[PDB]
Amino acid sequence: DDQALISEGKDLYDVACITCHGVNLQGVEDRGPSLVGVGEGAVYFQVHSGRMPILRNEAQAERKAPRYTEAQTLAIAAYVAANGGGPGLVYNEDGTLAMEELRGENYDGQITSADVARGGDLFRLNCASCHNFTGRGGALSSGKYAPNLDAANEQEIYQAMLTGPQNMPKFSDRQLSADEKKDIIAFIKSTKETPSPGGYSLGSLGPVAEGLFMWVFGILVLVAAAMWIGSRS
Amino acid sequence: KHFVDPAWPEHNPADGHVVTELISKVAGASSPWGDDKEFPVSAEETGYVHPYTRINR
Amino acid sequence: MSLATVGNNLDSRYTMASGIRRQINKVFPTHWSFMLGEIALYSFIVLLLTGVYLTLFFDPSITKVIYDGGYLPLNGVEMSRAYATALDISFEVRGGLFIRQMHHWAALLFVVSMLVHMLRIFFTGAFRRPREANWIIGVVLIILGMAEGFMGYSLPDDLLSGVGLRIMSAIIVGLPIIGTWMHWLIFGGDFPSDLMLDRFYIAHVLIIPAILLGLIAAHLALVWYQKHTQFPGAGRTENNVIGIRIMPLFAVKAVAFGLIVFGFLALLAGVTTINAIWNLGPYNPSQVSAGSQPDVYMLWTDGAARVMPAWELYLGNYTIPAVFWVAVMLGILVVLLVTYPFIERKFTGDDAHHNLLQRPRDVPVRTSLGVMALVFYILLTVSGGNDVYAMQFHVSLNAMTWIGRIGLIVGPAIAYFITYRLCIGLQRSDREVLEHGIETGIIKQMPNGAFIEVHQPLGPVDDHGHPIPLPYAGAAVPKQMNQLGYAEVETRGGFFGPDPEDIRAKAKEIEHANHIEEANTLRALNEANIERDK
Amino acid sequence: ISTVFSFLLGLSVIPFIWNVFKSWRYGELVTVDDPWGYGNSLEWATSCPPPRHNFASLP
Amino acid sequence: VAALNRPNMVSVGTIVFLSQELMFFAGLFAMYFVSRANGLANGSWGEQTDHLNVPYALLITVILVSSSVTCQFGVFAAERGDVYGLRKWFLVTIILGSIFVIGQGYEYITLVGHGLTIQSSVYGSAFFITTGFHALHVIAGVMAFVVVLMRIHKSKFTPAQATAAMVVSYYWHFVDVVWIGLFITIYFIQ
Amino acid sequence: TAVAPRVDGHVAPQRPEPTGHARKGSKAWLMMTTTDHKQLGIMYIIMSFSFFFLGGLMALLIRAELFTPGLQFLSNEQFNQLFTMHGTVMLLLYGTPIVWGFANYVLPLQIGAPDVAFPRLNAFGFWITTVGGVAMLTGFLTPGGAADFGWTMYSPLSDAIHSPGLGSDMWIVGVGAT
Amino acid sequence: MKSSAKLMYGPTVFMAAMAVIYIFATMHVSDGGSVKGVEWVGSVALVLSAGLTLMLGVYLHFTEVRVDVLPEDWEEAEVADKAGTLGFFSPSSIWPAAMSGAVGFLAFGVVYFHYWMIAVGLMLLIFTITKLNLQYGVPKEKH
Numbered sequence A: 001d002d003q004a005l006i007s008e009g010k011d012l013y014d015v016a017c018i019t020c021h022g023v024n025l026q027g028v029e030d031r032g033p034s035l036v037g038v039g040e041g042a043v044y045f046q047v048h049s050g051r052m053p054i055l056r057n058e059a060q061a062e063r064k065a066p067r068y069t070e071a072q073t074l075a076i077a078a079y080v081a082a083n084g085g086g087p088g089l090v091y092n093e094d095g096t097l098a099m100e101e102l103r104g105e106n107y108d109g110q111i112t113s114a115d116v117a118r119g120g121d122l123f124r125l126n127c128a129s130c131h132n133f134t135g136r137g138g139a140l141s142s143g144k145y146a147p148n149l150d151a152a153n154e155q156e157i158y159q160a161m162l163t164g165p166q167n168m169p170k171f172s173d174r175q176l177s178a179d180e181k182k183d184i185i186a187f188i189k190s191t192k193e194t195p196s197p198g199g200y201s202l203g204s205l206g207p208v209a210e211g212l213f214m215w216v217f218g219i220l221v222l223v224a225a226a227m228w229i230g231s232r233s
Numbered sequence B: 001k002h003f004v005d006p007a008w009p010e011h012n013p014a015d016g017h018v019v020t021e022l023i024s025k026v027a028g029a030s031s032p033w034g035d036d037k038e039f040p041v042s043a044e045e046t047g048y049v050h051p052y053t054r055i056n057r
Numbered sequence C: 001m002s003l004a005t006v007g008n009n010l011d012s013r014y015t016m017a018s019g020i021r022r023q024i025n026k027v028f029p030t031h032w033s034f035m036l037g038e039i040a041l042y043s044f045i046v047l048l049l050t051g052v053y054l055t056l057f058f059d060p061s062i063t064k065v066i067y068d069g070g071y072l073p074l075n076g077v078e079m080s081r082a083y084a085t086a087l088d089i090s091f092e093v094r095g096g097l098f099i100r101q102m103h104h105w106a107a108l109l110f111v112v113s114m115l116v117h118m119l120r121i122f123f124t125g126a127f128r129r130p131r132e133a134n135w136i137i138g139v140v141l142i143i144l145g146m147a148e149g150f151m152g153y154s155l156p157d158d159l160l161s162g163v164g165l166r167i168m169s170a171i172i173v174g175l176p177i178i179g180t181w182m183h184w185l186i187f188g189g190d191f192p193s194d195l196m197l198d199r200f201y202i203a204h205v206l207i208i209p210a211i212l213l214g215l216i217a218a219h220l221a222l223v224w225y226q227k228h229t230q231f232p233g234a235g236r237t238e239n240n241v242i243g244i245r246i247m248p249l250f251a252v253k254a255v256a257f258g259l260i261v262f263g264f265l266a267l268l269a270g271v272t273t274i275n276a277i278w279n280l281g282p283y284n285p286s287q288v289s290a291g292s293q294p295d296v297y298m299l300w301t302d303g304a305a306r307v308m309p310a311w312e313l314y315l316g317n318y319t320i321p322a323v324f325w326v327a328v329m330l331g332i333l334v335v336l337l338v339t340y341p342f343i344e345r346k347f348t349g350d351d352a353h354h355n356l357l358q359r360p361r362d363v364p365v366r367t368s369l370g371v372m373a374l375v376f377y378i379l380l381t382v383s384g385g386n387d388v389y390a391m392q393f394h395v396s397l398n399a400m401t402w403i404g405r406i407g408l409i410v411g412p413a414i415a416y417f418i419t420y421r422l423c424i425g426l427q428r429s430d431r432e433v434l435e436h437g438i439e440t441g442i443i444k445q446m447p448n449g450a451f452i453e454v455h456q457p458l459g460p461v462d463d464h465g466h467p468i469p470l471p472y473a474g475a476a477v478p479k480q481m482n483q484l485g486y487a488e489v490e491t492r493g494g495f496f497g498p499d500p501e502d503i504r505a506k507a508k509e510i511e512h513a514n515h516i517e518e519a520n521t522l523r524a525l526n527e528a529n530i531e532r533d534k
Numbered sequence D: 001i002s003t004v005f006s007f008l009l010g011l012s013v014i015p016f017i018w019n020v021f022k023s024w025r026y027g028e029l030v031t032v033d034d035p036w037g038y039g040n041s042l043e044w045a046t047s048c049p050p051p052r053h054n055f056a057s058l059p
Numbered sequence E: 001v002a003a004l005n006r007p008n009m010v011s012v013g014t015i016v017f018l019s020q021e022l023m024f025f026a027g028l029f030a031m032y033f034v035s036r037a038n039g040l041a042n043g044s045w046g047e048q049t050d051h052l053n054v055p056y057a058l059l060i061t062v063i064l065v066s067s068s069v070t071c072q073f074g075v076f077a078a079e080r081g082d083v084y085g086l087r088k089w090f091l092v093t094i095i096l097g098s099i100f101v102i103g104q105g106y107e108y109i110t111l112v113g114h115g116l117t118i119q120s121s122v123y124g125s126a127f128f129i130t131t132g133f134h135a136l137h138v139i140a141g142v143m144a145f146v147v148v149l150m151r152i153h154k155s156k157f158t159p160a161q162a163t164a165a166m167v168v169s170y171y172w173h174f175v176d177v178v179w180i181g182l183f184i185t186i187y188f189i190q
Numbered sequence F: 001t002a003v004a005p006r007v008d009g010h011v012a013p014q015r016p017e018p019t020g021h022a023r024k025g026s027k028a029w030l031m032m033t034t035t036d037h038k039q040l041g042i043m044y045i046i047m048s049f050s051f052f053f054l055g056g057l058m059a060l061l062i063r064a065e066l067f068t069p070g071l072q073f074l075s076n077e078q079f080n081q082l083f084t085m086h087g088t089v090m091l092l093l094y095g096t097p098i099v100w101g102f103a104n105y106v107l108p109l110q111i112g113a114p115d116v117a118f119p120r121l122n123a124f125g126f127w128i129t130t131v132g133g134v135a136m137l138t139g140f141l142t143p144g145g146a147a148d149f150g151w152t153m154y155s156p157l158s159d160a161i162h163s164p165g166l167g168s169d170m171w172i173v174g175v176g177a178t
Numbered sequence G: 001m002k003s004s005a006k007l008m009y010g011p012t013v014f015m016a017a018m019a020v021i022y023i024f025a026t027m028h029v030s031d032g033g034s035v036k037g038v039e040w041v042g043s044v045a046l047v048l049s050a051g052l053t054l055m056l057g058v059y060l061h062f063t064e065v066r067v068d069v070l071p072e073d074w075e076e077a078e079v080a081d082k083a084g085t086l087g088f089f090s091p092s093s094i095w096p097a098a099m100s101g102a103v104g105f106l107a108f109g110v111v112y113f114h115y116w117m118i119a120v121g122l123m124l125l126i127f128t129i130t131k132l133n134l135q136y137g138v139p140k141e142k143h
Ligand code: HEC
Pocket: A049, A051, A061, A062, A063, A123, A126, A127, A128, A129, A130, A131, A144, A145, A146, A147, A148, A149, A151, A152, A156, A157, A160, A161, A165, A166, A167, A168, A169, A171, A184
């Protein structure tokens, strides 16, 4: 199997990745870095989320529609992993690529609230600085930004934490252990999927949103009421 | 008998209608103020009361 | 009905009849924008009621406790009692979230209603003699409203609010010479302090609301005493008021508008979140978020802090931080606002006693100054939230701070110029219609081929048809025939069928009669005014 | 060669902008309905500039 | 002595505008037919039209043509000078157009319930772009009828308001024709 | 052919005033609100020549970078953005609006009409063209920049999978508004 | 308006001819620089284009058949034949610029695909078109 997978990966790499990363994955000076030693996790995160191929150099590559199937992604990841290893994918106990099982360390059907309570503090210390409380995004220097954490699946959250994409820091499994990462996943998916009890969230941005809402349209409708009740002469 | 709006022009019944989808009796748009009206009128019958304003100097 | 007895008692005990008779006949002008102050007042009322409710469930202590309550995604987390009782309001009290939401929405509406009310007062010129005292009281009121809102969101001790307390503390230490001593006075020590939230609590619930209620009482008493201003218009002079009496019209209108503001804030309280404190977690000096902004009425101060460059003085063993100049700038703006009637007196040379308002088109300097100050304030507000702007519209954050810096110069200038020319253009458009009359829109061809647009004169006419141009009277001039009434509906009845003809004819007869009566009333009153000036 | 003459072609708009600006406010005044003399179309049967509704009379 | 008959200018403008709206829908139909050609190149198209619901589409077709008959009755009322007949028939037309768009929204909700989406297939993409742009045009049409009812509520009914009503009837006839064509292509011949 | 009477007291009609004699405030609110086809035509023409200067500046940057073999100050991306936006500005913000501006001015004078048929729709056309221009050029204010797929926007190069920047959306809505 | 209505049948006949020709040709003819098959874009485009010119030609003809002999459609008309009212024309309006601004807000919302921007832009657009269409009919104030 694995050699057929590496053949498929090499053939896809040769018509999609070879201009910026070189034929021996060494990198091309100002087009892309070396892929020697990135691992299957880096290729999975980058290709599956749609970030690769980059097609113009800017401040930041953006998440877009994926160019390769998940099977094709894993073929390319096999081929790249043969050029010096690196961190790999998180598989579950049966052997399938792990997904909803990563929703907290004590997952069993549903998210447990202790995991959310510890992952909230972990996220608020290690992540929210860039991604805002509950992961709505943030702006960095010179056109860079921390994305919105909605589109990412659990495997992508884990591999983002491992691989440190673009200006994101790395969080090895010695820094944040497996359980702490799984609790961060639990927190992201709890907040990403629980409607606010107090009605419409207004994007959960914070005070600027409610400001704009009131200080434009809220005062506008009461000005309209005043014009209904009062005289224009 | 069927209803006709009091602001509607009277017309020769042999001449069809005041307006219909294909044709009108005017080259531009009909006026919102009734084409049977003739302007100007006296300022007395517009009802505009021009204020007298003096402010403290 | 027994009222004979009731009134007989009241008057006999208080000699009441003459005073209340003077009150029920007081006239109020009914322009729509004269409602705006009422909005602020009603917001304030809602704020007091909901506020007292929230004091029955809130523990302002900074003492740490392990949380066990309704919100299970913070069970086992150590937090101060302030944050814990905020969470218990939100999740343990039936309807508590609704009331806290209404309180916060009412705070926002309070500050913005005061803002737009102040804008009416500024653009219409109402601050002039005899009404500068109300201007001064009002700027004090709006500054206190800002301060009250700051202390209000600072109380629940969540992460976002505590970052703002941290920032305010850091401003205060930086002041020379007395910064460190001022800080140890206000906070009672190093930040965060044992007494911090309790002093903020009693400031928020007792002291500032009392200054606010006393100043609102003085403000409204003084507006009642010096009767309301009015716009120019037919019959309206410096020496009268024209509008509607209190009993029954203005009082019922005010109660209805109060119902509408109350119901609008109640609807906001349910259908939209305003401060999900549970999503922010308790305060920690080591943590922070990306878009950690203050409330909108404070964004201008944050924006000032962002746009000020790193101009810091190092004087031997001492130093004046860069954030000193922020406080200088903000202070200047504030002082300028409170002293506008007096510099306008200096530079217009007018110190007369006014009771007739100005249209803003008729006073271009003040309109342009106010608009460029609004552009200044809006740019400081938008720079105070510039990173959310950059995240959501994909601008460079460095470009945004530079837009703040360069724009606080070039923007107000461009705004002044654009505003001044639009003022004069509206002004000149009024003179066009007082000279030649309303353009009817009807184009008529003459036998020689000429196309002429029919005008409608508003006054008498010359022997050659050209109007005798009327003087500008400070009032609004109608610009289309529908304003004179030439599009009014000529059929009476409901939606699906007319009324009987016997009702329709008589009704239109009455309507035309009342129009003539009202017009003649205003004309006679206008002539009495001309005569009373000889 | 092409770029050298491109910058020349770019300089060409400097007299054009100056001519428009100057003539708009200080240009020779037109005293005739048709300053070129032999205007064919109807726009030269009316004044310079036309009135608001174009024609004071038609031929 | 009487005045000459001239072309109704507002009608001419409306017909020119409706010609270019027909040319708008041309492109969406061309997209559909290119997609259909590629889909019949391997028989996948028929398996996606096996989700269609022709009786219900025919029902809402009947409703929309009835509403067009209704607005023409309103046109007759207007040109006679009767605000009340017009004001009756246009409200009936607004009710029927509301029923149309709600039925089309239900059609979308059920199609999404069992497969068909913009992303699930090329058929779904073509189907929802064409029917969604048409539904947006229907919503703009009922907006037009409501604004006419406001106009004739608060301004006297002169011929200038009657011309407005007549050209809004023209717009509703255009959307009815676009629906008949779109129904004939995507439901019958498929 | 009829002949009129030599009517008494006849003097020619008064000539309107030329440009350059304007008082302040004479055109601000008029510009904002006018439905005169010929003021609208002057506005069209001034607007389109301003865009001509913009697009031509882009073209002269292109010609500067093609002056010698290496890349002296532009990148590949910026050169692509430049020719794309030069083409779009010159065709859709100079060409078509100057066509409609000359039409607006002279056509009612040529056929002998006082106004155009739909004056407020004329005003709408002018303003929506200006907003299309502003939208199209707003892409340059992003960090990534404008659209860079040529003014033809060939596919699949125009798909999101192959041109993900926001400028690629802005270009679309720009041409749509125009 | 005879000549205007009638000259729309030149392009109608021509575009219909080119449509049928293009259709048969693209499906039957073969050359080494293209693949045989009916080309649907050009087909639909040309037939709908002939539909547009058919639409204008037929409506204008059906109007022309019952308009009188107007002075502007007459070779020896006197200038005094159109004397009288010509029609109503809007003298001024702020609402065109308003509508352009509404469409601008909508388009930028579509760009960024912020849902609130799309909602607000559509609300603004319906409002501004409504206010445009109610301009010359707003009541006199009844106080
Ligand atoms: C600022 C210095 C960051 C911190 C701290 C963290 N992240 Fe981040 N993250 C950041 C950037 C600039 C990016 C973009 C990288 C790219 O190549 O696009 C990201 C990306 C992610 C993602 C991917 C989301 C997606 O679109 O698929 C995830 C899931 C993510 N980051 C999660 C995450 C977590 C859980 C963090 C705390 C442990 C964290 N990030 C830190 C910037 C920053």
